[PDB]
Ligand binder design. Structure first.
Ligand code: TE5
Ligand code: NAG
Length: 355
């Protein structure tokens, strides 16, 4: 069980002005720290943020959070569930800023909501240094779905923060799970309300609404008004200096959702078949030069904090093994691969996919 700590700096808030926070379980004999970012879509204007506040409030406020939370998957402390990092210090940072962990804007008399995701990460790191993070050797910033994209947007800033506070010996790394999207053509198409708004347009509006921030090198390449590009992994990843391991289903359920694909009634005709085969090929292509990656040919969404994350294999190697091999490479390894991308072209052509 990880136990809740609300941030001591009460100016760093969730959407509704309530204090943000984190769940922590220490491991006194370890110098490894795992900070995990929760996901859960986003909202980009007053009307659709108000809708989210009615029926997804724990993603916008801490007033109802529980005092503890069970560590699952990579946040588990039992070697059987977590062969990778079971003895690490474990941190779960709830997502209550609806801004893909990018915002830096306070609630005020001209802002109904606060969007402080980027500042929430920075403040969690600050306060953890007084609880043991000052003695760490490796800080792994992990995340799933919107939290996976948030890793890509924040890993280099965390590294810069620790360097300027005087801790250059801590190695900062990233683990981005299910946050690697494509700004591709949709299967069927509409004009930008909430759902008809393609991600590129919804993110462009989000950024102005949240006062979003993106990594510096990427910001300098794309420049004013085009920062939305840095929310797409294959565009921001080449600009990053910290080592980042990428986990991505080739047929991600959230990617199909934004593409207006619904697999139902099961009779796939030629146009949809070619669309789905082309999406898998495109995702494979963006990963060819990512040396640390795990990309199975499955229709699913998220993996690393799920209890049975040990079951899926690519070319005979599990995800927890691939992550251990990555640890060893950061000291090519015989029988310990780090780049694992399926080549078969249809969902579930890998027999180990989640059912
Ligand atoms: C779970 O919902 C989402 C949506 C998006 C996203 C949408 C448009 C552009 C870039 C990213 N990203 C993540 N990581 N999660
Ligand atoms: C509290 O957080 C705000 C916003 O990030 C920051 O401006 C301020 O310096 C912080 N105060 C302390 C004491 O860390």
């Amino acid at each position: 069980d990880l136990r809740l700590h609300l941030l001591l700096n009460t100016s760093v808030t969730c959407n509704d002005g309530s204090p943000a926070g984190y769940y922590l379980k220490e491991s006194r004999g370890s110098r490894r720290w795992l900070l995990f970012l929760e996901g859960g879509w986003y909202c980009f204007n007053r009307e659709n943020c108000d809708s989210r506040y009615d029926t997804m409030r724990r993603l916008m406020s801490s007033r109802d959070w529980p005092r503890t939370r069970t560590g699952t998957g990579i946040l588990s402390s039992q070697p059987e569930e977590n062969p990778y990092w079971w003895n690490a210090n474990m941190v779960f940072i709830p997502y209550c800023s609806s801004d893909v962990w990018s915002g830096a804007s306070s609630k005020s008399e001209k802002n109904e909501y606060a969007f402080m995701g980027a500042l929430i990460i920075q403040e969690v790191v600050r306060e953890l240094l007084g609880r043991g993070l000052s003695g760490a050797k490796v800080l792994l910033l992990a995340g799933s779905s919107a939290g996976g994209t948030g890793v890509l947007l924040n890993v280099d800033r965390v590294a810069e923060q620790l360097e300027k506070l005087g801790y250059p010996a801590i190695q900062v790394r990233g683990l981005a799970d299910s946050g690697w999207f494509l700004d591709n053509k949709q299967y069927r198409h509409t004009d930008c309300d909430t759902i008809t708004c393609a991600p590129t347009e919804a993110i462009r509006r989000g950024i102005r609404y949240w006062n979003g921030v993106v990594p510096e090198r990427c910001r300098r390449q794309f420049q004013e008004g085009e920062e939305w590009n840095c929310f797409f992994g294959y565009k921001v990843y080449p600009t990053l200096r910290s080592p980042v391991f990428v986990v991505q289903w080739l047929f991600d359920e959230a990617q199909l959702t934004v593409d207006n694909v619904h697999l139902t009634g099961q009779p796939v005709q030629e146009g949809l078949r070619l669309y789905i085969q082309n999406l898998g090929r495109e995702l494979r292509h963006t990963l060819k030069d990512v040396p640390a990656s795990f990309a199975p040919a499955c229709l699913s969404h998220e993996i690393i904090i799920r209890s049975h994350w040990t079951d899926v294999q690519v070319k005979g190697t599990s995800l927890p093994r691939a992550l251990h091999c990555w640890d060893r490479s950061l000291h090519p390894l015989k029988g310990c691969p780090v780049h694992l991308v399926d080549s078969c072209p249809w969902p579930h052509c890998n027999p180990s996919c989640p059912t």
